[PDB]
Design a protein around this ligand. Structure first.
Ligand SMILES: Cc1ccccc1-c1cc(Nc2nc(CCCO)cs2)ccc1C
Ligand SMILES: [Cl-]
Length: 371
């Protein structure tokens, strides 16, 4: 089980694709919902995601079919296509997934944010960093639902620097484009979803607190946080969850005016990576860093909830820390940081001490020694 959110709001979920092409926006939306009696949301909704995941794990695409047999009916606790909870403007989070991931794999995070009164737009990237993604070749294809699938690209060592950077720059553009789509839907623009889903986008009219915008992301998505902030001042702060800093160009480091929070795992980080995070620091800028004790890179994504403790530890899906314990720390510290830098009038300042790494299961800053 992926945990239910800790906040007071029921959670709805839907998907949005606009336009239908490979240059359009594809996102999974988590939102405060009016109703709580809908079907739960299918976690990995298409066989081709399992094929993609199998390719990313270095197994045969038929191991994909075994993963599909085991996980293909798994849900996540969000009311599928539930009506939006009316009568309130909600702050917006744009969320960026890691390498080998896709839009649906960070629901523990998206559901928790939505339960505290956020709308969350978890983008699916078309940069070939997703395990799989899909789109439609043209209008005819979209209509009949003839999907074109795009699978993860494996790089030669010589391609690494250049292609990771083209990818992080495409990802930032995709974050900005997803922001503009939501803001236009808030500002009442008719949008025909390329997906035929029983969720009317007209509900999102006048629903966004249009200045309370953040960008959050894990791993490759954590670098996407930083690139997005440097290029799009509409994002007011960012939270990088175990950021993988390698994709970033030398230029970006001095170019991030917004508050930025690094939440790291204990076991993923390494000097080269930490050195890059410290390059984002400047005396005029707001920066925070915490490390979750006993945690691994996978503690921020949903696979940490998908198996039991023994298999979980073996597959490096789980750390020494309890997965619910770890995500609560990262989600609660994130809420307090967002309240502070978005100027929210909620009770998220009850977790201010977590921003400073003041908890038995937090390390202030980093455990990693650099020079
Ligand atoms: C547990 C599970 C359920 C359904 C499909 C696959 C798995 C699985 C997943 C991993 N790990 C992965 N990590 C990523 C990147 C995430 C973002 O960093 C993609 S697959 C390892 C082993 C298994 C069986
Ligand atoms: Cl790790």
């Amino acid at each position: 089980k992926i945990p239910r959110g800790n906040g007071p709001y029921s959670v709805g979920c839907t998907d949005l694709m606009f336009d239908h092409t490979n240059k359009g926006t594809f996102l999974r939306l988590y939102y405060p919902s009016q109703d709580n009696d809908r079907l739960d949301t299918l976690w990995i909704p298409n066989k081709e995601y399992f094929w993609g995941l199998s390719k990313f794990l270095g197994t045969h695409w038929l191991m994909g079919n075994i993963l599909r047999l085991l996980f293909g009916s798994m849900t996540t606790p969000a009311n599928w296509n539930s009506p939006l909870r009316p009568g309130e403007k909600y702050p917006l989070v744009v969320f960026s997934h890691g390498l080998g991931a896709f839009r649906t794999l960070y629901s523990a995070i998206g559901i928790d944010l939505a339960s505290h009164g956020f709308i969350v737009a978890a983008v699916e990237h078309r940069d070939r960093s997703a395990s799989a993604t899909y789109y439609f070749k043209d209008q005819s294809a979209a209509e009949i639902g003839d999907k074109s699938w795009l699978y993860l690209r494996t790089l030669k060592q010589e391609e690494e620097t250049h292609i990771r950077n083209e990818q992080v720059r495409q990802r930032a553009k995709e974050c900005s484009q997803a922001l503009s789509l939501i803001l236009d839907i808030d500002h009442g623009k008719p949008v025909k979803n390329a997906l035929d889903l029983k969720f009317d986008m007209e509900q999102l009219k006048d629903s966004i607190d249009r200045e309370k915008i953040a960008v959050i992301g894990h791993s490759f998505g954590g670098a996407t946080v930083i690139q997005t902030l440097s290029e799009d001042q509409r994002f007011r702060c960012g939270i990088a969850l175990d950021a993988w800093m390698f994709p970033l160009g030398d230029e970006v480091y001095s170019r991030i005016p917004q508050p930025l929070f690094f939440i790291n795992s204990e076991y993923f980080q390494y000097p080269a990576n930490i050195i890059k995070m410290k390059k984002c620091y400047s005396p005029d800028k707001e920066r925070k860093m915490i490390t979750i004790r006993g945690s691994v890179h996978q503690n921020f994504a949903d696979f940490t909830f998908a198996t039991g403790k023994i298999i979980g530890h073996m597959l490096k899906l789980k750390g020494d820390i309890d997965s619910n314990v770890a995500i609560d720390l990262s989600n609660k510290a994130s809420l307090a940081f967002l309240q502070k830098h978005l100027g929210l009038h909620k009770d998220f300042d009850q977790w201010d001490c977590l921003i400073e790494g003041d908890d038995e299961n937090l390390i202030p800053g980093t455990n990693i020694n650099t020079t």
